[PDB]
Amino acid sequence: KIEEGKLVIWINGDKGYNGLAEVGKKFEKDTGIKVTVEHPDKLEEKFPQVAATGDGPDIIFWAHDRFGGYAQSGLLAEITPAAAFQDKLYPFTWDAVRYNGKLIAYPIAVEALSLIYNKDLLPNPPKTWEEIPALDKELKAKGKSALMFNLQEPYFTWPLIAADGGYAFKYAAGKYDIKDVGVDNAGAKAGLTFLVDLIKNKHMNADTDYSIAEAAFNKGETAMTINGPWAWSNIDTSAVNYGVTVLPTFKGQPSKPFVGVLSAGINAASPNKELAKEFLENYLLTDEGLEAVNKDKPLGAVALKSYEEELAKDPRIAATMENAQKGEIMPNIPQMSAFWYAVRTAVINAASGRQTVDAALAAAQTNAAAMSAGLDIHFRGKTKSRNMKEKLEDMESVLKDLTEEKRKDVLNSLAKCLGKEDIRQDLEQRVSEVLISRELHMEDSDKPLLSSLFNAAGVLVEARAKAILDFLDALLELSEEQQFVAEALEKGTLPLLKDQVKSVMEQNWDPEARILCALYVVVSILLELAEGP
Ligand SMILES: OC[C@H]1O[C@H](O[C@H]2[C@H](O)[C@@H](O)[C@@H](O)O[C@@H]2CO)[C@H](O)[C@@H](O)[C@@H]1O
Numbered sequence: 001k002i003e004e005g006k007l008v009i010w011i012n013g014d015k016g017y018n019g020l021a022e023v024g025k026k027f028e029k030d031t032g033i034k035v036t037v038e039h040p041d042k043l044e045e046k047f048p049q050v051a052a053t054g055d056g057p058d059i060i061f062w063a064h065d066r067f068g069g070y071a072q073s074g075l076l077a078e079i080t081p082a083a084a085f086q087d088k089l090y091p092f093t094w095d096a097v098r099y100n101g102k103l104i105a106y107p108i109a110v111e112a113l114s115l116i117y118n119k120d121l122l123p124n125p126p127k128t129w130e131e132i133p134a135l136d137k138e139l140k141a142k143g144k145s146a147l148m149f150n151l152q153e154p155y156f157t158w159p160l161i162a163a164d165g166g167y168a169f170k171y172a173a174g175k176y177d178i179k180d181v182g183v184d185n186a187g188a189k190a191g192l193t194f195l196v197d198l199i200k201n202k203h204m205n206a207d208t209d210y211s212i213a214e215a216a217f218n219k220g221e222t223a224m225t226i227n228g229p230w231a232w233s234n235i236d237t238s239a240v241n242y243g244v245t246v247l248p249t250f251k252g253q254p255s256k257p258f259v260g261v262l263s264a265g266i267n268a269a270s271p272n273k274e275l276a277k278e279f280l281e282n283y284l285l286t287d288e289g290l291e292a293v294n295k296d297k298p299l300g301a302v303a304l305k306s307y308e309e310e311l312a313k314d315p316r317i318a319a320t321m322e323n324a325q326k327g328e329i330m331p332n333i334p335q336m337s338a339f340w341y342a343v344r345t346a347v348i349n350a351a352s353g354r355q356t357v358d359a360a361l362a363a364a365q366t367n368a369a370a371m372s373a374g375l376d377i378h379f380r381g382k383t384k385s386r387n388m389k390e391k392l393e394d395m396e397s398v399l400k401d402l403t404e405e406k407r408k409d410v411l412n413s414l415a416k417c418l419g420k421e422d423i424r425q426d427l428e429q430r431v432s433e434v435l436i437s438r439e440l441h442m443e444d445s446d447k448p449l450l451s452s453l454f455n456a457a458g459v460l461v462e463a464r465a466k467a468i469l470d471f472l473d474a475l476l477e478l479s480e481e482q483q484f485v486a487e488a489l490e491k492g493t494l495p496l497l498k499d500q501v502k503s504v505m506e507q508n509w510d511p512e513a514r515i516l517c518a519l520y521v522v523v524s525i526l527l528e529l530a531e532g533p
């Protein structure tokens with residue numbers, strides 16, 4: 001239960017939350033309404049977890065790319081600003097927050113990654129990625145690194161991966177093709193390979209994360225970093241004489257950052273919706289409110305035209321917008337979280353050597369395709385008494401009691417059902433007949449699974465049959481995600497898929513919910529069979 005007569009606001013810890021709390025203060029002074037601003041960790045995951053139960057903040061700040069998924073899960077109030085208010089913001093910002101024709105958040109600012117360089121160490125920064133190793137080699141001799149940036153978050157490495165041809169979902173003539181994913185093409189492989197080569201040749205470290213990179217640049221130990229506008233404040237506090245510029249090219253093509261619009265959404269369960277709209281339209285999105293935030297940590301190019309004409313004088317904003325033009329605004333579609341989780345794991349696995357480049361990107365492509373199809377609730381037709389957690393837990397313990405041979409025999413039959421409604425329906429008829437009759441018939445003798453339902457005394461174990469019927473009911477819920485589950489089984493990458501399916505489930509373990517639950521069941525069962533308990 002969110003508390004009436006109060007505003008609670010979540011925003012990321014790298015953003016200007018103290019600035020925002022200043023606006024919160026002004027609001028209370030004018031209206032007597034208390035505003036509390038918080039910066040929880042993992043906010044983008046935590047929000048949909050608490051909001052799914054009707055709890056959480058009244059207001060949520062994140063880049064626009066998450067909001068479509070929140071909207072599809074019913075977690076956000078529809079935003080309806082008057083036309084007089086809308087015309088004050090850049091129209092491309094409203095686009096970023098428009099989902100299936102409705103506005104699902106207020107746009108705040110545009111953020112793009114830039115190349116940030118130390119002027120004293122590197123008066124003329126490199127224009128190509130290809131120069132960097134030689135440059136690092138020379139700087140290392142003098143006790144400095146050429147480039148350090150967060151390799152843990154794919155937001156940071158995606159610009160190199162996209163440069164020669166990687167993409168998330170194909171975008172043609174104003175429409176995204178969620179069935180055409182660009183994660184394992186030649187261009188993405190070339191970029192990720194360049195990155196992994198930098199690591200292997202000791203120009204960067206696989207474990208470099210946000211705070212390490214920040215500290216190194218700000219303490220003058222590295223000539224370059226890659227970061228957003230929010231980072232400029234800490235650099236201002238430090239000794240460093242820095243510039244902000246276009247990212248280096250790769251194979252003669254520009255680095256293509258995914259560009260975010262920081263946005264503010266209103267919790268669908270909030271009992272203070274009118275107060276939130278009032279705080280956002282009349283306090284935050286004003287010259288004065290944006291200035292308070294921007295002076296704590298810079299926002300980038302703000303959505304409010306009146307204040308952005310001031311900020312556009314800064315050449316750091318020009319560089320931000322130069323990179324923004326070379327990159328692409330992210331989609332706000334639910335499938336974005338799928339893309340992100342897949343790419344995140346791939347880059348980390350490739351960087352650390354846990355997977356090769358080709359293998360990391362082939363698995364990511366498979367997972368993103370599977371999860372994208374699951375999140376696409378549209379155009380589906382299904383024709384021609386226990387907790388879902390409870391059922392999976394039951395099913396898994398039954399299969400755990402099997403011998404290993406019997407597990408593989410179950411798996412042989414189930415893998416044949418994937419993508420084949422005829423085979424699935426037939427196995428369902430047979431398992432069900434065996435369950436009633438307690439006997440195997442002649443047409444059962446070539447189905448390994450069906451003998452697997454019997455113990456070494458030749459007697460049927462009813463719970464094995466029921467577990468299988470439960471799996472085949474779940475598999476029916478799935479449409480085209482089935483073929484990607486097969487690929488993952490064939491390539492040995494089900495554990496990545498299971499992990500990614502869990503991360504995508506907004507809630508802790510709704511049409512979106514039914515399908516992903518089913519997908520999690522199917523993947524979990526296949527993994528237990530393929531790799532053991
Ligand atoms: O790394 C994947 C991640 O990218 C973006 O997250 C950014 C965010 O947009 C910035 O505002 C800032 O907080 O840095 C984050 C990277 O750590 C996407 O917005 C997010 O959905 C995605 O998971």
Ligand code: NA
Pocket residue numbers: 324325326327328329
């Ligand atoms: Na562009």
